[PDB]
Amino acid sequence: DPLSIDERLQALVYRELNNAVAFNKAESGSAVLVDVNTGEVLAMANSPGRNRTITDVFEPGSTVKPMVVMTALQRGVVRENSVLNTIPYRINGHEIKDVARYSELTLTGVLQKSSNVGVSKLALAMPSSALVDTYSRFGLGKATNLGLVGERSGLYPQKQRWSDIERATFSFGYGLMVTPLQLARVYATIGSYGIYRPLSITKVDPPVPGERVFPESIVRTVVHMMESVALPGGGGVKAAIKGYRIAIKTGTAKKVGPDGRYINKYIAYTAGVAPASQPRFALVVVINDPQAGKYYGGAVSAPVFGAIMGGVLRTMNIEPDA
Numbered sequence: 402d403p404l405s406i407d408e409r410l411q412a413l414v415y416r417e418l419n420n421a422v423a424f425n426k427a428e429s430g431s432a433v434l435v436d437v438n439t440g441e442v443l444a445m446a447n448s449p450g451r452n453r454t455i456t457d458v459f460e461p462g463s464t465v466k467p468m469v470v471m472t473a474l475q476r477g478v479v480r481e482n483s484v485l486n487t488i489p490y491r492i493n494g495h496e497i498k499d500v501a502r503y504s505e506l507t508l509t510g511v512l513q514k515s516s517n518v519g520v521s522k523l524a525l526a527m528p529s530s531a532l533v534d535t536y537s538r539f540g541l542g543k544a545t546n547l548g549l550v551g552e553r554s555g556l557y558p559q560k561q562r563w564s565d566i567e568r569a570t571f572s573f574g575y576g577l578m579v580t581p582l583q584l585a586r587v588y589a590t591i592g593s594y595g596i597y598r599p600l601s602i603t604k605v606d607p608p609v610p611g612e613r614v615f616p617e618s619i620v621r622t623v624v625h626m627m628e629s630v631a632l633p634g635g636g637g638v639k640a641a642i643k644g645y646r647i648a649i650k651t652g653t654a655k656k657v658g659p660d661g662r663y664i665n666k667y668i669a670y671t672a673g674v675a676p677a678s679q680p681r682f683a684l685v686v687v688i689n690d691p692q693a694g695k696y697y698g699g700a701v702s703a704p705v706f707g708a709i710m711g712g713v714l715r716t717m718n719i720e721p722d723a
């Protein structure tokens with residue numbers, strides 16, 4: 402009753418998640434929905450119910466990329482209209498390449514096409530501490546404190562010195578492990594334009610004072626850029642919702658084994674905020690080990706993200722902004 406969960410939104414999330422997990426023949430799926438102004442968890446669901454995926458840890462992969470662009474802008478490595486050389490290259494034999502090859506991309510392009518090359522060149526242009534600092538500001542490598550077992554088990558680098566390959570892979574979301582709850586908190590901080598708040602499972606009266614972790618102007622710039630992910634040419638186009646602008650990012654990660662080996666099992670993500678013009682909600686959707694033939698975030702997680710976010714916007718009577 403001081404519980405923040407809105408059961409209308411919980412039931413919607415559960416139903417859509419159940420359907421997506423079944424359709425993709427996946428092990429499981431999770432969705433976490435957060436009010437970006439208060440940190441209230443409005444919905445939090447695992448499918449199947451007893452697969453406690455919301456508190457399991459995973460490499461966040463390309464979902465970290467918006468923070469990379471924010472950091473490069475803050476440090477003056479790039480400007481709003483910058484164009485990056487995105488030609489694939491090598492680091493000591495390690496090949497850095499994108500799924501789709503481009504010789505150059507704008508910062509919007511880098512997010513739209515999810516360019517590993519583009520973000521890695523940004524990272525190598527900055528000290529190793531730069532992204533460590535930003536990810537930390539957004540709450541990665543800090544526990545969530547909702548009182549759920551597992552909440553605290555994420556892996557985050559405490560390293561003093563970094564190799565070139567480590568710095569690059571960090572920029573596209575490997576070499577650290579986070580829970581869906583931590584990722585939802587990142588995106589809630591994006592939706593607030595740089596105000597960090599802890600997640601709450603209990604009701605609060607707004608406004609809720611938070612911690613300014615990043616300038617409003619920078620976060621707003623990248624939120625606009627993320628709108629391209631949900632338009633034609635963008636990886637998350639299947640999340641698009643009629644009448645609304647959404648700001649999202651897709652991701653796909655190969656699962657790492659305990660000996661550090663990557664296996665042919667996938668984790669698919671879509672994380673974002675809506676409506677993009679003035680965010681009310683942050684949503685993270687994770688689909689664990691899809692087996693039905695598709696495994697990219699845009700194919701597997703983006704459709705259910707659109708169905709959930711669309712249902713939320715309608716239920717909460719949010720004014721169409723498209």
Ligand SMILES: CCN1CCN(C(=O)N[C@@H](C(=O)N[C@@H](C=O)[C@@H]2N[C@@H](C(=O)O)C(C)(C)S2)c2ccccc2)C(=O)C1=O
Pocket residue numbers: 461462463464500514515517570573575636651652653654655663697698699
């Ligand atoms: C550190 C070693 N190691 C770990 C494994 N690994 C990795 O799993 N790579 C994935 C990757 O690059 N992931 C995405 C970030 O999420 C990019 N965005 C995706 C999206 O938007 O869905 C995309 C369009 C599919 S590519 C990938 C690429 C292609 C297919 C599946 C997964 C690495 O690359 C990597 O170096």
